[PDB]
Fold this protein.
Amino acid sequence: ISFKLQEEERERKDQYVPEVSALDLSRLNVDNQTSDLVKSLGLKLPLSVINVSA
Amino acid sequence: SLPATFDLTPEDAQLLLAANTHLGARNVQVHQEPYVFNARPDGVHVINVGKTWEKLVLAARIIAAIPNPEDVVAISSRTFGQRAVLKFAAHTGATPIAGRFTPGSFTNYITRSFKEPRLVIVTDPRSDAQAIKEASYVNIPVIALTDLDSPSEFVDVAIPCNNRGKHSIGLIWYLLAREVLRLRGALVDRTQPWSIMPDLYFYRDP
Amino acid sequence: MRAKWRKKRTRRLKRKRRKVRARSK
Amino acid sequence: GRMHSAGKGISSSAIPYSRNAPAWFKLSSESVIEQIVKYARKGLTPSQIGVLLRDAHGVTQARVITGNKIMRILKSNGLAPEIPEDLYYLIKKAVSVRKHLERNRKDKDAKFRLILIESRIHRLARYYRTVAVLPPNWKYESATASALVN
Amino acid sequence: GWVPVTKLGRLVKAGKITTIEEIFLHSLPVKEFQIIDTLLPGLQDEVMNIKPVQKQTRAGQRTRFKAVVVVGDSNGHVGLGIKTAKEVAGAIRAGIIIAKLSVIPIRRGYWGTNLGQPHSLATKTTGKCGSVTVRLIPAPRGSGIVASPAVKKLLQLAGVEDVYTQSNGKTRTLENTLKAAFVAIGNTYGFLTPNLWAEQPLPVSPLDIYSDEASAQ
Amino acid sequence: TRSSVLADALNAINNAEKTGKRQVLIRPSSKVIIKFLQVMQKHGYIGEFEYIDDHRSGKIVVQLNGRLNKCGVISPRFNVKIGDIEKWTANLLPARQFGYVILTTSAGIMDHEEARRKHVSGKILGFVY
Amino acid sequence: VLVQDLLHPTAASEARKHKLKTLVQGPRSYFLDVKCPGCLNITTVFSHAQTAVTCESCSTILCTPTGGKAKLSEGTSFRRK
Amino acid sequence: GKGKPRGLNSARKLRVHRRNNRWAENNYKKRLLGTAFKSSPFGGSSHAKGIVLEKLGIESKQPNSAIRKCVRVQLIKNGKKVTAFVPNDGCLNFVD
Amino acid sequence: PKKRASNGRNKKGRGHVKPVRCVNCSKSIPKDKAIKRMAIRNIVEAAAVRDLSEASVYPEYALPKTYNKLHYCVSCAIHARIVRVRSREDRKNRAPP
Amino acid sequence: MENDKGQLVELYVPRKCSATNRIIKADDHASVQINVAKVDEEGRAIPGEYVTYALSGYVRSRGESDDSLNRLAQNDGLLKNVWSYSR
RNA sequence: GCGGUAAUUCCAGCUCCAAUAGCGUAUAUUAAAGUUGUUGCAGUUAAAAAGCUCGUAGUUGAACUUUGGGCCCGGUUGGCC
RNA sequence: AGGGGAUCGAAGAUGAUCAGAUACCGUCGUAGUCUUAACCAUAAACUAUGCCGACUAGGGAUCGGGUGGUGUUUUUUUAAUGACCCACUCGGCACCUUACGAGAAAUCAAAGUCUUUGGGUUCUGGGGGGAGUAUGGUCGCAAGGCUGAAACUUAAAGGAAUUG
Ligand SMILES: [Mg+2]
Ligand SMILES: [Mg+2]
Ligand SMILES: [Mg+2]
Ligand SMILES: [Mg+2]
Ligand SMILES: [Mg+2]
Ligand SMILES: [Mg+2]
Ligand SMILES: [Mg+2]
Ligand SMILES: [Mg+2]
Ligand SMILES: [Mg+2]
Ligand SMILES: [Mg+2]
Ligand SMILES: [Mg+2]
């Protein structure tokens, strides 16, 4: 079933964005070969190479 | 044959790596190894981020090469790709086929969902093989958002990404749409970031 | 007309035919 | 492959492309020759001489350092045997199997393997008689075989 | 009053594409028989045979009729159509549309020197449907079609006028034999010849040219 | 075992062309194969090919150009007169205007056309078209 | 792939392939100038020695044979080439 | 090599193989053994004359049901006796 | 026509395995072709345990189990419904349940 | 192919696969022709001008048209570092 | 395959067909037969891979030895008084 | 022909069961089952798929061997070795997917590289019966094995798949 009122409230409730969040910097665990990749590509980034445990 | 401002810029790279779309599949087949980057221990392969962007630009050139935006068909059948394709429809011409593909849509000219596109872009070759297989009967170019373990049969153009990531799928559709509108008189200022955020390309639950 | 039993019948025939030719030989 | 079997292995020694060798071996080709003569005087076959030279020394190949091969060296200084090494090993293998069979008559597997060995012996001996290494009418009698291996 | 339903139909009824050669060159699928009818007004058909077919049921036999139809002008265009239907007249009709939809061209050449129009085939060809395999060999002028009547008519409707045929297999199976000949003549363009060794500008599709007129709303 | 290295070479080229590969690797590369590939290359059926020189028999890497329908060998090498070239070409070549029957005659490896204008004949090696 | 450098294979490819299947086939073996602690002499030995090599001074063992590469006698000092 | 040898000097093998396998043909076997001259009422002849020993009424094979009205004759050249059809409606009154 | 790619058994590279008689009808069948089933069972049943254990010294000692490897022939498997014939497309499946 | 007096007498000349150099015949309904629109400065489409590549159905069926475009576009300069000749 | 009460097949009349001063029938052979097979068959299930291995005659059998370049003489489509 | 003969068990006995049974079933039970020395030489002796060689597509699993990880793991904390994990690799038994290609189809990575017909070689077939029969030869104590027709008779016999 699909009526115009339902599709319009769907568009209204789909166009809503929850502000600025989930992408802002919190300090990217860009690991070492990715750092090698981006430095070969010659691009600047917030270097953060982490060494996980076993 | 294209200017040097097209290269992967740090802000696009930052948002790309924030989506973690550089994460590939555990196993790769022979047709995705031109995009391998000498995998991590535990077997998680990683992708040529530059090649992802470069194929994205080439596919964007294909999309902004059909005169009519209203005869390009975007196929999705996964919950992550639904909202991305619908927003792709809101911003480009790019008519969607979300949810069921309704087999017999490129053939069978008496169906309600009968469309005749000049180009079809699929979110996942594996879960959208029905559209790909049917389009192979009627000469329709295929642009697939592939992963490392994805079929490449009848796949004309492939953009490697992470297909297990909701953020990755939404952002690739965002980037493709942004470059398509940039490759025409709607996003003339190519240096500035486009006015909105991929937050609503991302599939939102429930 | 199983082939094994038809084979048995022809072997029986061959034995009997050689025996009845034996007295003439 | 496997003349008298079904196995299809390759298992070969891929010698280097360089015909001139080996850029670190400072011994003289002469000194290598009398080394070869010394082990042969001890009584080593060309194959055994080759492995022992290649192991205890730096002699990569006899023919790259010396102008000729190990058997050619032995023929040159009069130490080559009457029976080539491959033929003699085949005959001694046949001799061992024949003695084993005489003790254990009911080893049909050994009897089959013996027939295969003698066929290899006869093919190789026919080739040698063609190249005139063995005299014509040189037969592998198999009743005077053990006397040919001593 | 025929309303087109596909972009090719719109651009054909509007008169943008006026020759079958654009469809062939761009390999455009054809889903309407009016398109082939419009672009080839002198397209004559012919019926090879009608054969009865029975499907056994719980009671009685449900009997259907299968007609084989060959269509095509003598300029180098042929179609082959197999259709099964309840009534023979409807079977003939639907077979003609199917034969119209399945129109493909042919390559004519010379046994020859370069003299005159291309009478024979450019290359030896073979097709195989089922067990039947039908081989076509170029022949000199005056030889005519050397073939069994069914294949010979199809070759004549292709416009070939000098050819040798060699059929192997159960040629009495008409539909397989006709399909085999159809494949063999269709492969005349799948083959590559030294006279086709040059390069072409790879023209854009007329669909791309007239995308605006297609998909009228 | 191996009996016709030319047969294996031509089979490898045929398989590569069928699957569309723009190059093929050939072993063990006799000089007969060298001449036969030169005849193809002169007539334009193959492009540039390479002789990799290992010290044993050599390999070959051929660059194809999607222009070869069938390169075959005629085993055995039948003796052909000048009056047999026409029947051999009719049997093998798909037409009369193009395709080549490759012969080995005393004047060397060459195709049927230049063999005819030289008025010589030898044994038959293969065909290409 | 339909197109690839058969003439110029990657060094990684040639390294990981078999010693018979490489473009120009060659050995993966080598020689060791190896130091036995017994004396002042340097002994040149094979990688896959397949025998118990020994020197005049250290006349017991220098490397013990195995299926593939010979195992050194646990006190030597090896060098390639 | 799919069976047959392809040696330039293998013609002897090819021809003898063909010669041995040629006997499986029906007409070649019959003609070469000459069964027409030995085991046939006509000694390899198109026609033959004979003498009508009697008349016979042969009931036709199924699914037919009719009497065929042949005549049992005895050939002059071989003495062999054989039934011969008398083909037409009537014509048994002419043979006697 | 051939019904199964692996004929009815598990034998490639052998030519002979051993016979094993069926536990039900005593038919001699090859061991690879035999339908083998493990029957791991408790000692009595699911309702006797209460009275058995309240009348048992060595309280809750082990509840021992009986182990055996039943071998069935094809006919007995069909009859006693251990295999339960499948369809043409569904017979290629080899998962246990 | 021409007649005696020049005059090309051929029912059309067919497209060829830019990948495998195979002729695309009429009923090859799995063959594609992809068009890449040109680009000038500021990354505009500039409609009407294209670079066209024809892929045959055989290559496409084999899952092997993607790498062919990679090679061709790397050749034509459409892409910088997507295709590697050596493998 | 027709013939058992409407026989488009028998015995006849009419009409029609084909070849024609010629046309049927019998036997043999050739093509059809890629159903004898070099060209050119087939062998999982249609007839047909010896139970398996050795082995003589027979058939078949890796690569390699003068390549390339230059100079001259000189025949042919014709291309223009 | 000797030894041995526990079990099972052609023949047989005996109980049933039947319209009948000398069939299925129950209980016994000679030959056999086992072994030695000799015979036989046949099986749905099957992968119903000859052997050798090359190429053509992807994957993981396993066996044997090897190569390479500052990999893990034990016994002295951790050495060596051994076992396990990962990536190659050669050879092997296979398996999974798809249809490039093949096939009448079932299906087949060989049953592909076949009318675009030729890598080498051996064996066999020519509609179904008669018939693996008669006869001749050879081998065998025997049972039989190898070789092997014809007269005459028939328009089908057959293969794979569809519907009922
Ligand atoms: Mg080998
Ligand atoms: Mg059955
Ligand atoms: Mg067995
Ligand atoms: Mg046949
Ligand atoms: Mg059968
Ligand atoms: Mg059979
Ligand atoms: Mg076998
Ligand atoms: Mg047998
Ligand atoms: Mg058999
Ligand atoms: Mg026959
Ligand atoms: Mg027969």
